[PDB]
Write a protein that binds this DNA or RNA. Sequence first.
DNA 1: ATATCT
DNA 2: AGAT
DNA 3: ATCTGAAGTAT
Length: 279
Amino acid sequence: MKYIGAHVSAAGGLANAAIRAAEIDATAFALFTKNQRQWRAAPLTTQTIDEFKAACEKYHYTSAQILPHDSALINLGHPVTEALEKSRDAFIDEMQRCEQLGLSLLNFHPGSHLMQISEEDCLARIAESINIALDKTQGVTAVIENTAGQGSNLGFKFEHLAAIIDGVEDKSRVGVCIDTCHAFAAGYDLRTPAECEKTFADFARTVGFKYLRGMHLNDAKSTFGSRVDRHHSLGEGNIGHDAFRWIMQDDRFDGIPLILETINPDIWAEEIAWLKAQQ
DNA sequence: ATATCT
DNA sequence: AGAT
DNA sequence: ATCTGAAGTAT
Ligand SMILES: [Zn+2]
Ligand SMILES: [Zn+2]
Ligand SMILES: [Zn+2]
């Protein structure tokens, strides 16, 4: 059983995310629990929480089918102490909002070294940030998303993900989400079934599927190994439709949120339908 | 710096 | 991308 | 149709 959806808008209230997901016949969904471009947000109200839970129940979205995404401002590997602490506090709040909403997963990008510290140093800070958040919360798994490798963003190599996991104390609450556009942009080919086999065997050897908690299904406007993060609708990008059919036919991607972050929301219902039909 | 993306 |  | 304000890619 596969859970297929998209990162829908939470405008007007978190419950609206569940409503919008149901509208496109999604069996999974992602969302921001607050403005992704602002540091502070009003505390969740009992009404917002209840309406969200009610909507999730009404449309059959269990926590295993929802993959919230954290703010874009957070840098869990920031080289400057003040900024690192600010990011950590915000991440803790993000995890706590998940707790309050009955969610069990939180997808986030690792962090960036900003050319001020070593890769190893940065990865260590990220692992510690996760350890701190896990010590302050319960029931929420920190899901590390791989990245395209733009600028000083880390997490573009599977080895980075493995290194962070190695530094996390409570292995039961850490995992990863693989974004196909990011992987492709970072140099992991997905243009043919054979390349997909190779790329995921690499993932298996380095990270291990036991840690896979979600997928972001995005084609790529950017090119192979370009290290540029630009999404595209399925089949219209440089990856092509083969990779997505392959993923839908592989049982290793069962029981986790498979999230579209494609650029034309007006065809999400159709993209979801197509993905389902590939199984 | 401006526009746009994630 | 969400609030106003 | 403007803020918010990390990090980054083009221009
Ligand atoms: Zn992401
Ligand atoms: Zn993504
Ligand atoms: Zn992306």
